[PDB]
Every structure is written in C-alpha cells, then in structure tokens.
Design an enzyme around this catalytic site. Structure first.
Site, PDB file in Angstrom:
ATOM      1  N   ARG A 182      48.458  41.732  39.684  1.00 18.06           N
ATOM      2  CA  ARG A 182      47.945  42.928  39.704  1.00 18.06           C
ATOM      3  C   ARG A 182      48.928  43.738  38.937  1.00 18.06           C
ATOM      4  NH1 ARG A 182      48.636  46.043  43.438  1.00 18.06           N
ATOM      5  NH2 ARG A 182      49.437  44.865  45.096  1.00 18.06           N
TER       6      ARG A 182
ATOM      7  N   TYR B  15      43.635  37.230  36.199  1.00 17.06           N
ATOM      8  CA  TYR B  15      44.584  37.066  37.478  1.00 17.06           C
ATOM      9  C   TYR B  15      43.655  37.901  38.545  1.00 17.06           C
ATOM     10  CZ  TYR B  15      47.989  35.163  40.442  1.00 17.06           C
ATOM     11  OH  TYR B  15      48.685  34.400  41.334  1.00 17.06           O
TER      12      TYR B  15
ATOM     13  N   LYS C  12      40.056  43.931  45.478  1.00 19.85           N
ATOM     14  CA  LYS C  12      40.731  45.012  45.587  1.00 19.85           C
ATOM     15  C   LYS C  12      40.067  46.351  44.947  1.00 19.85           C
ATOM     16  CE  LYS C  12      44.345  43.271  48.018  1.00 19.85           C
ATOM     17  NZ  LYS C  12      44.448  43.612  49.634  1.00 19.85           N
TER      18      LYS C  12
ATOM     19  N   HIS D 108      42.678  48.375  54.277  1.00 19.21           N
ATOM     20  CA  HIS D 108      43.375  47.229  54.112  1.00 19.21           C
ATOM     21  C   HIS D 108      43.876  46.660  55.334  1.00 19.21           C
ATOM     22  CE1 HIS D 108      46.867  45.348  51.656  1.00 19.21           C
ATOM     23  NE2 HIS D 108      46.310  44.467  51.550  1.00 19.21           N
TER      24      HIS D 108
ATOM     25  N   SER E 172      53.307  44.414  52.500  1.00 13.93           N
ATOM     26  CA  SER E 172      53.431  43.241  52.010  1.00 13.93           C
ATOM     27  C   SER E 172      54.624  42.518  52.619  1.00 13.93           C
ATOM     28  CB  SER E 172      53.445  42.907  50.448  1.00 13.93           C
ATOM     29  OG  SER E 172      54.785  43.203  50.008  1.00 13.93           O
TER      30      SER E 172
ATOM     31  N   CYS F 162      55.218  41.286  55.731  1.00 12.51           N
ATOM     32  CA  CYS F 162      55.242  41.297  57.375  1.00 12.51           C
ATOM     33  C   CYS F 162      54.599  40.337  57.964  1.00 12.51           C
ATOM     34  CB  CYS F 162      54.614  42.938  57.459  1.00 12.51           C
ATOM     35  SG  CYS F 162      55.666  44.112  56.894  1.00 12.51           S
TER      36      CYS F 162
ATOM     37  N   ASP G 207      42.524  40.541  55.311  1.00 13.75           N
ATOM     38  CA  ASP G 207      42.873  41.439  54.339  1.00 13.75           C
ATOM     39  C   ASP G 207      41.946  42.708  54.245  1.00 13.75           C
ATOM     40  OD1 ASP G 207      44.514  41.953  51.953  1.00 13.75           O
ATOM     41  OD2 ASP G 207      42.702  41.481  50.994  1.00 13.75           O
TER      42      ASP G 207
ATOM     43  N   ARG H  96      48.815  31.535  44.594  1.00 13.08           N
ATOM     44  CA  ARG H  96      47.764  31.695  45.502  1.00 13.08           C
ATOM     45  C   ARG H  96      46.971  30.459  45.858  1.00 13.08           C
ATOM     46  NH1 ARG H  96      47.040  37.257  47.276  1.00 13.08           N
ATOM     47  NH2 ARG H  96      48.805  38.339  46.041  1.00 13.08           N
TER      48      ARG H  96
HETATM   49 MN   LIG Z   1      45.709  42.633  50.666  1.00 13.67          MN
END
Ligand SMILES: [Mn+2]
Length: 596
Positions: free
Chosen positions: A72, A221, A230, A250, A272, A274, A297, A391
């Site tokens: 992103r 991407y 998103k 989220h 992010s 965690c 997500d 990914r």
């Molecule tokens: Mn996410």
C-alpha cells in the site's frame, strides 16, 4: 471469461462501457468465478512470466513484483469529497504530517484521472469482476463491480471475494464502481521487472463515497489493487456505515467455546505486528476450550432487532503476511496455505517450494534459494529472502478451524470487542473498560511510538473525529446489548528483556477470563485504568514462573507520560473534531492517575 456482457444489469453495464471508452482495452471479458476460468487465468499468467508454478504443493503459484510496487502507498491514497473537513480533521497546527488520511478535491481528482487513465489499457484485455463483500444473501452484504487489466488481480479477487453469476443475480443500481489499471499500456517502451506492470511514479488510490466509487491507478499490489480488501471493506464501507447505522472495522472475529458448551463471539482490532492472524486461528492451550475463526481482518457489524451486535466477515479468503508463518507459530495458517494458494514476493526453493524467514517446512540438504528479486540467496545475506510485506492469498474455507457460521448470512453475535497493542512496559496483559465511552477512549488511544486508533489509522473513509462520534452514538442505541470492551497487551517484558507472557495458545487464558466477564462473573478488581482480573481468576495453572504482578503493572510514572502523549496527539491530530466524551475520558484518567 466470456465476451458476452448481456447478463450485466444496466447500471453495471454502463460502468463497464464507461471504463472501456476511457481505458481503450483490446477486448472485454466478463468473469464468472468458475474453476475453468481460474485454470485459464493461471495458464495466461504462467505464459506471461508473472506466475511460477510451485510443484512441491497442490496448485500453488508464485508471483514477484517490481521492487517499486510492494505495498500500500499511503502517501498516494486519498479521500475525495467536496469538503475537506468531511474527510479529515484540520492539519496538525504545529506542522506535523497528517496521519488520519489524505484529502484530494474533486477538481484535483478529475484532473489526475485525466492524466492517467485515457488509453491506459491499450492492447490489454479489460476484465469485469462482479463481486459480493459477504455472503451474497446476507442483509449485511454489499456488491461491487471491479474492472481491471490485471489477470493477477482477477485471480486474487476470486479468492478474496464471492465472484460470478450468484452476484449478477443480485446486482442492481446499488453497487460500488471499482476502476483499476496497472497503468502500463501496450506497446511497452522498456522491459518490465519480474514481468510486473506498474506505474509507480503516478500511483493513485482514490475513494469517492458520494459517487459510490473507488479509482486505483499504477499498482498491481494487494491493498492498492484488490479493491474489495481495504478500499471497499474499510474506506468506502466506514462512510456507508456511518450514514446507515452500522460499523465497518479492522477487526478479526473469532468464536470461543467453553468446556461446558457455551459459545461466545469476539472481535478484535490489532495494529500491525501484534499477532492478529495468530490470535484469529489460534490453537488454544487451555483444555476443553475451542477457538474457531470467522475472519482475521475485516468485520462488518450491525445491531439486529433484538439489540445484538451481529458481525459478518465480508471477505472469502486470507491475504496474509507470509514472513514469520510456521507450523510452530500457526499450524492452522500452514494448513490454509498448503494448496490453491498464490504467494507474492516470497522466496523460491530448488525443490519447487517457497521460503520466508521463520518457515519450518522440512527440506532436503542442499536445497537452494532464489529471493523475491530473482537473485540467488543464502542464509546470512544482508537482505531477506522474502520481502517483509510478502503475502499468501488463500481461500478461507481451507482453514481447519473456520467457524461453522463464518459464512452464515445472519452474522454472529459479538459480546466482546478487544483492542490490542504491543508495549514492553506499562500496559497490562488485559484491562476491561468501565463502560462504553471509556472503551471508545481505549480504542482511540491504541498505539503501534505511533498512534493507531481502532487500528483504523490508514483506513478512515471520513473525518476520524466523526468516526469516534459514530462509535459513541452507536452506544446510545435503545436496548442494544453492547459488547464489553477490552484492551490487551501480549508483549510486556521483564528486567531481562524476555516476555512476561508466553502468548500464542496461552492467549486462550485471557479469552477465557473475558468469556467469564461476558457471563457476569465477579472476577475483576478496579484500577485507575479499568477492571483487571483478580489474582487467581486468571488461569495460570500450568504456567509456573509466570508472575501475575509483572502482567498487571500499575505504574504512575508510565501513565502520567501516556496521558501527556495522548493529550498532545489529540490536540495536534483531531483538534476541535475530537468528541468531548473522548477528551472527558482522558481528563478522567488524568485525575485517577493523580491520586495513585
Ligand atoms: Mn488488515
């Protein structure tokens, strides 16, 4: 894939033909989501040099990207609204960088489109992807049509959303128009890197809620190109939710079953790094307890007629960060990605398998590696074999612990919402809010040291202060059965720098306590920051050496500093757009800390 578009209803057909006249593709193909279409797409992608087969596995494939197109691009991601204040709060008055979203005027946006899209698909097929976010028959589901010139995007959207006929049957005027191009019209004037077309200097990922529209240019991407992921599921959806009385968040969603047979669902927002996916597909280490995955997500949530908060996972697959994934850390993820999976920017092995830091798949001696850059790689190289944002893209139905109701159209009732963080000091293992407004404050105060309110920082679809207002207003719903709100921190460290909490499957012990709190159990003691488990009411049996007092620090110095930081953060970043109730919660915390 078919050239016949007669099955598209009128408004969808209009959008497709608008994109065709603008982008000037060589042909127009309607996607049907079928197995035969997937095989066709894979064949073309292999022929184009984009996909490498991975013969070690069952139907898995590897893509690599241009090094300029790997994530992103927040600086090029924008909200397009007539009024800037509808999109974002005032710029930080002391001159700091805006961190709650980027605004672009309609004037500027249209001029940007006109520099980029005309003729952008020359010599390329345009693909039409009718898709549903959520089970197509759910009252919470929302439809889109994405057009794109990337077969990679088509293949991934098929995995990540519901695509095809069943969507077409439901499609009317109410859908999100999703316009995408990699921005590399033919003929090319120079060689591609890793067969990956992009236009990095001109990337634009735009969100125009008043037009039910997402426009994305120049990147192939994930977050930029899979417009459901998103762009739709958080940015466009959050604004729809604010207007229509629901929540687009989220958050992972999981089911927890007690040994005695009661089941409760919980949602959790983690910034992010965690262990979000590790929690959503955890194998619990408390005998008798079961964990099921609903999603890892995105959560779309709406109160039902009985006042229960119902959540759906609006996605059909997982688009997960690969590095760190192992059988030791996440056997459920390993099972999920073992077949029918597309990997992007991981390493490639001589035995036809994949590689990333942390991977523990047994391999023969003498196996060698090629990095995501297509260069030979060996352990000790200054660069990782897999890109850190590499990914997997896998169908959710392959996860061994998918909840039986993970694609139930009615959604699942949420009785707890958990905010997560990663702090070496100060923030206890688990804390419960004293009430709704207090919990909204905890969510607004999340860190990632960066602030990441509700884990939504990069994904707001409208003024973040007004999003906080929407959360406060939501708690005022007459007869709502509001979930209890919690904040967790798995990552406290001891004097020697080791974690105080073993984490992973033992996190089930924290969920068990939360479960009991949902049940009305008298298992908490009050502190300046909220309710914490009484010593003895958090199950530490089988965890000898684990020190309760280290899991629940109550440090005045830490909280004085945390309050100062939050006050500065709110002042600079939200200003007058911060709801009074949130500031009142900070003031309450300050006073409680003063007396500790
Ligand atoms: Mn996410």
């Amino acid at each position: 894939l078919s050239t016949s578009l007669s099955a598209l209803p009128a408004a969808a057909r209009d959008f497709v033909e608008e994109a065709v006249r603008l982008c000037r593709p060589r042909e127009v193909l309607l996607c049907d989501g079928s197995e035969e279409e997937g095989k066709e797409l894979l064949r073309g992608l292999q022929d184009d040099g984009v996909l490498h087969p991975l013969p070690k596995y069952d139907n898995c494939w590897l893509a690599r990207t241009d090094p300029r197109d790997v994530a992103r691009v927040e600086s090029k991601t924008v909200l397009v609204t007539p009024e800037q204040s509808d999109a974002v709060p005032p710029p930080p008055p002391s001159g700091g960088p805006p961190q709650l979203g980027n605004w672009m005027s309609p004037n500027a946006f249209q001029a940007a489109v006109q520099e980029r899209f005309p003729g952008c698909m020359a010599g390329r097929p345009l693909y039409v992807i009718p898709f549903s976010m959520g089970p197509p028959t759910s009252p919470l589901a929302k439809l889109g049509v994405q057009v794109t010139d990337s077969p990679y995007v088509v293949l991934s959207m098929r995995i990540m959303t519901r695509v095809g006929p069943a969507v077409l049957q439901r499609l009317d005027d109410d859908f999100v128009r999703c316009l995408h191009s990699v921005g590399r019209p033919l003929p090319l004037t120079e060689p591609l890197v890793s067969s990956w077309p992009c236009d990095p200097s001109r990337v634009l990922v735009a969100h125009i809620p008043s037009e039910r529209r997402i426009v994305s240019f120049g990147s192939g991407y994930g977050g930029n190109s899979l417009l459901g992921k998103k762009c739709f599921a958080l940015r466009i959806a959050s604004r729809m939710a604010q207007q229509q009385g629901w929540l687009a968040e989220h958050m992972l969603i999981l089911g927890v079953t007690s040994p005695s047979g009661e089941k409760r669902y919980m949602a959790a927002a983690f910034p992010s790094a965690c262990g979000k996916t590790n929690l959503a597909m955890m194998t619990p280490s408390l005998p008798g307890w079961r964990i099921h995955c609903v999603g890892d997500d995105i959560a779309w949530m709406k109160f039902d007629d009985e006042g229960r908060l119902r959540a759906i996972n609006p996605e059909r697959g997982f688009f997960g960060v690969a590095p760190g994934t192992s059988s030791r850390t996440n056997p459920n993820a390993m099972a999920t990605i073992a077949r029918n999976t597309i990997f992007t920017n991981v390493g490639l092995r001589s035995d036809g398998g994949v590689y990333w830091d942390g991977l523990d798949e047994p391999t023969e001696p003498g196996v060698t590696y090629t990095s995501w850059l297509g260069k030979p790689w060996k352990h000790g190289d200054p660069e990782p074999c897999a890109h850190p944002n590499s990914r997997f893209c896998a169908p959710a139905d392959q996860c061994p612990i998918m909840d039986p109701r993970w694609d139930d159209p009615e959604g699942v009732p949420i009785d707890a919402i958990i905010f997560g963080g990663r702090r070496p000091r100060g923030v206890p293992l688990v804390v419960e809010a004293f009430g709704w407004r207090h919990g909204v404050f905890m969510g607004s105060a999340m860190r990632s040291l960066m602030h990441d309110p509700f884990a939504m920082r990069p994904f707001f679809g409208y003024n973040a202060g007004r999003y906080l207002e929407h959360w406060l207003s939501t708690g005022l719903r007459s007869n709502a059965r509001l979930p209890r709100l919690f904040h967790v921190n798995w990552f406290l460290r001891d004097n020697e720098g080791r974690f105080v909490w073993p984490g992973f499957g033992h996190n089930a012990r924290v969920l068990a306590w939360i479960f009991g709190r949902i049940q009305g159990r008298d298992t908490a003691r009050p502190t300046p920051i909220g309710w914490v488990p009484k010593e003895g009411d958090l199950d530490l049996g089988g965890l000898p050496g684990v020190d309760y007092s280290q899991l629940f620090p109550m440090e005045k110095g830490f909280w004085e500093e945390e309050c100062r930081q939050l006050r500065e953060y709110y002042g600079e970043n939200f200003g007058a757009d911060l709801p009074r109730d949130v500031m009142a919660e900070l003031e309450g915390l300050e006073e409680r800390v003063r007396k500790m």
